[PDB]
Design an enzyme around this catalytic site. Sequence first.
Site, short mmCIF file in Angstrom:
data_model
loop_
_atom_site.label_atom_id
_atom_site.label_comp_id
_atom_site.label_asym_id
_atom_site.label_seq_id
_atom_site.Cartn_x
_atom_site.Cartn_y
_atom_site.Cartn_z
N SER A 70 5.55 3.79 5.72
CA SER A 70 4.50 4.31 6.59
C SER A 70 4.73 5.79 6.89
O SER A 70 4.83 6.21 8.04
CB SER A 70 4.41 3.49 7.87
N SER A 92 -1.68 3.52 11.23
CA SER A 92 -1.20 3.49 9.85
C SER A 92 -1.94 2.49 8.98
O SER A 92 -1.78 2.53 7.76
CB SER A 92 0.30 3.18 9.82
O1 LIG Z 1 4.33 0.31 11.53
C1 LIG Z 1 5.51 0.11 11.14
O2 LIG Z 1 5.92 -0.97 10.65
C2 LIG Z 1 6.49 1.25 11.25
C3 LIG Z 1 7.20 1.68 10.13
C4 LIG Z 1 8.09 2.73 10.23
C5 LIG Z 1 8.29 3.36 11.45
C6 LIG Z 1 7.59 2.95 12.59
C7 LIG Z 1 7.80 3.61 13.89
C8 LIG Z 1 7.09 4.76 14.24
C9 LIG Z 1 7.28 5.39 15.46
C10 LIG Z 1 8.18 4.85 16.33
F1 LIG Z 1 8.37 5.46 17.53
C11 LIG Z 1 8.90 3.72 16.05
C12 LIG Z 1 8.71 3.11 14.83
C13 LIG Z 1 6.70 1.88 12.46
#
Ligand SMILES: O=C(O)c1cccc(-c2ccc(F)cc2)c1
Length: 242
Positions: free
Chosen positions: A95, A47
């Site tokens: 994200s 991301s």
């Molecule tokens: O990179 C981040 O801060 C973020 C922001 C929103 C969602 C997630 C995320 C994605 C897949 C998952 F399996 C667990 C969390 C990560």
Amino acid sequence: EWQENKSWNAHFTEHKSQGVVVLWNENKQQGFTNNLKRANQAFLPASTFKIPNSLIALDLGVVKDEHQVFKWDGQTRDIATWNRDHNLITAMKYSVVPVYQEFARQIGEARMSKMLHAFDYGNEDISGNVDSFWLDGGIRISATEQISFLRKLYHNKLHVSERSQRIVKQAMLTEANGDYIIRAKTGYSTRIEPKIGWWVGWVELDDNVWFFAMNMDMPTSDGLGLRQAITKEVLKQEKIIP
Ligand SMILES: O=C(O)c1cccc(-c2ccc(F)cc2)c1
Ligand SMILES: [Cl-]
């Protein structure tokens, strides 16, 4: 030049973790890290790619401005905050992968490859699906290469319009108070091993800017908060933030 401070390794050791923090003092043009070798190890950006992706979408008109609404496609996904309408700012904040996958499809392979070469971004390899190569394709970027790219963005030196770069830097806004401003983007790479977390950006001070790029092994979602927490403990140790 560069200087290796292994004392920061404790910040990873305390959590039974492995990773690198890379700091760059813009005024003095000096870099610092706990691990100069991992500082140059290239990973999937995940991301963190939403930065260049946002820039390209804006410069080509795929995204007109930061208020344009990208409607939820009615598909319920495992991420609750993804199941709603978004603009560029909230897309970045939460994200929202599916929104940027749509960006990528409209950008197209040819233009995406051209712009990543123009950005000197990582290995500049978009092999894979045009809408997922930054998650499970061939593109790779190191922590030091993230800083190099971010420094171009900060100074509006990337080969897109100044407007596009200002808008993305607005969307990168993460934290601001009387002591500092942080513009950054998180990353979480899970589709190909090793699973890692990213946090890249910079800390604005009154009279200087510290760019940072960190990644750490992330076997589980439980440790995602350590991306920011570890970075800030290093910043505090170096008296960059209180
Ligand atoms: O990179 C981040 O801060 C973020 C922001 C929103 C969602 C997630 C995320 C994605 C897949 C998952 F399996 C667990 C969390 C990560
Ligand atoms: Cl702003």
